[PDB]
DNA sequence: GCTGCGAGATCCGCTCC
DNA sequence: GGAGCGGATCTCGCA
């Protein structure tokens, strides 16, 4: 946790990994990995709970597409109409069973409305609307629709309706399609939630800013007290701080820190 | 382990179907338009899409007893049993969940304006605000059970290694011949312990004079 | 034990260097011509001539920080820190000592013509007249601290006895786990003192919450 | 119609006092 | 259990 932060930072400086890879490798919190990645000047100059929504039709019926950037999870459900009210119904019914944090979409008649933004404001999940001019996004969106629509005709004859094939497509994609060590995309999502839940136990007691002094040990010589430095994250007797001089993250034991009243 | 149940409720001349879990307590709600079996079939397959059950128990229904329905449920491979449940625990859980959801939905009336939005919002509130045990949501305990069963099923991989190794000793200031092959007993940092056949004695040998070989046929 | 602090004071355009001690409480004041590095080193050497300090604290000052000063201090080989002491205890002690010495010096200025003789007489009178408790003068505490620092004392710490036991922590009547074996420190009546490995903090555990390890048979 | 060799160190396993 | 002791084993460099 606290101890391996500089190791992750220097590894990312060497190789320029991503936040998810750093989290899976060094075990650092996802927030810390995101902070490290975002602060990279080269990176400034793809993640969990990040989804994309696209519109498609088949046999003159309305269907919505929800593609997860990381877990490769696809979800769909029948939609009566493209109006704003029905669109909101589907969007928040999507949150009924999922807990995302980011979402991207294009411009549409039901995307923008006087009540659409205020409704998502209550949910609190950040959403960005823009034009996907990235060639990677263009080629990634194309394959998902073909993959989901190819499985439709493989099970039409003995299913009664199209909404019946709606669940069959999800069964074909999210249940049987497996990579790695026989891991399904839903397995990836469920496992991701496991390590995602851990950081709540730490951030629950960390929601109150504190200033503290730090002391640098050099060959067993305490030297002096230095600070003040903002406490980044807490640990079992270890505290990580930012050095103003060397611009590096340092780890100090709990026996060389005091409390400064606000 | 992975038991599910179905129950319908009537409110304001409308029918709401509820999926209930016994061991964990998952609750799901949906608005059933008509009593035709097509709606029940599509709801069941949507549930199979969004959930991975192993056992389902339910009462009798006008559309449940149909050859096509049994054929479809056997196509999905799930099991189902007929007859009214006689377990008081299941009845108590179902009644408590139904009364709680009814109370929550009737309390939440002024906040919404639409209907489908209202049902899905009630689903959100019931599935999120329900804190059981150490503040665990029903979906949270469900994913806990899934990850626990997955890790207990996959834990056998780390146990089936039984790798083989060679070893050699220093005699009269010079290295000896590569004795083996043999199966390692315990391997830690710096050295590993092995069983010798010449003297039937345990010997600890460092990593600087060993070789690692997969077990033979 | 044997904690010292060095400070400067001004009186009638005269610089006086003062050493304040915590355990013995003795004040040592001398006259310094100027707050230069070489003279500061000379004064520290004069102070070290009859005393053997172990812990020293200093405030901010240009003479305190210097490459030659730090080399000389490492020549001393004594645990000392230099910086800005914001601890209220040290500041309060030093200001109280300064106030006391300022109050006391003006009483014996007239009959003693020499300033050095006057300050020596004042400090002599203070350390021979002022007594606390049952009549404990500061040099008695100082010699007690000095005689507690015998080299032969450290070797007399293990005659025959050494034991081991477990310990469990209690939080509002709810006990914890045994935390593994740990080394004992001393055996009291009704409770014992142990050292934690995770936090390096000394704790006290009741006898009823401690499981004794039997001696080898 | 024929050819490698041993001196000088070092321990094991032994038995005997 | 201490004790020395006979012998198998090792490398290297003559040309
Ligand atoms: Ca020759
Ligand atoms: Zn980077």
From Swiss-Prot, chains B, C:
<feature type="DNA-binding region" description="Integrase-type">
    <location>
        <begin position="163"/>
        <end position="215"/>
    </location>
</feature>
<protein>
    <recommendedName>
        <fullName>Integrase</fullName>
    </recommendedName>
</protein>
<feature type="domain" description="Integrase catalytic">
    <location>
        <begin position="1"/>
        <end position="146"/>
    </location>
</feature>
<comment type="function">
    <text>Catalyzes viral DNA integration into the host chromosome, by performing a series of DNA cutting and joining reactions.</text>
</comment>
<feature type="binding site">
    <location>
        <position position="7"/>
    </location>
    <ligand>
        <name>Mg(2+) 3</name>
    </ligand>
</feature>
<comment type="subunit">
    <text>Homotetramer; further associates as a homohexadecamer.</text>
</comment>
<feature type="binding site">
    <location>
        <position position="95"/>
    </location>
    <ligand>
        <name>Mg(2+) 3</name>
    </ligand>
</feature>
<feature type="binding site">
    <location>
        <position position="59"/>
    </location>
    <ligand>
        <name>Mg(2+) 3</name>
    </ligand>
</feature>
């Amino acid at each position: 946790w606290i101890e391996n932060i500089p190791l992750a930072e220097e590894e990312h400086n060497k190789w320029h990994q991503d936040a998810v890879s750093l989290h899976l490798e060094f075990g650092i919190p996802r927030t810390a990995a995101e902070d490290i990645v975002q602060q990279c000047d080269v990176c400034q100059e793809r993640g969990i709970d990040h989804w994309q929504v696209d519109y498609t039709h088949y046999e003159d019926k309305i269907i919505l597409v929800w593609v997860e950037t990381n877990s490769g999870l696809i979800y769909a459900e029948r939609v009566k109409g493209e109006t704003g009210q029905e669109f909101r119904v589907q969007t928040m019914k999507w949150y009924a069973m999922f807990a995302p944090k980011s979402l991207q979409s294009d411009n549409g008649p039901a995307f923008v409305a006087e009540s659409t933004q205020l409704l998502m404001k209550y949910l609190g999940i950040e959403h960005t609307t823009g034009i996907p001019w990235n060639p990677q996004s263009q080629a990634l969106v194309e394959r998902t629709h073909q993959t989901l629509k190819n499985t439709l005709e493989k099970l039409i004859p003995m299913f009664n309706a199209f909404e019946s094939a709606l669940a069959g497509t999800l069964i074909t994609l999210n249940i049987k399609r497996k990579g790695g060590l026989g891991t399904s995309p839903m397995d990836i999502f469920i496992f991701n939630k496991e390590q995602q839940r851990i950081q709540q136990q730490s951030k629950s007691k960390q929601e109150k800013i504190r200033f503290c002094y730090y002391r640098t040990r050099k060959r067993g010589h305490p030297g002096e007290w230095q600070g003040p430095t903002q406490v980044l994250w807490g640990g079992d007797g270890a505290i990580v701080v930012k050095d103003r001089g060397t611009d590096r993250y340092l780890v100090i034991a709990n026996k060389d820190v005091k409390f400064i009243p606000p």
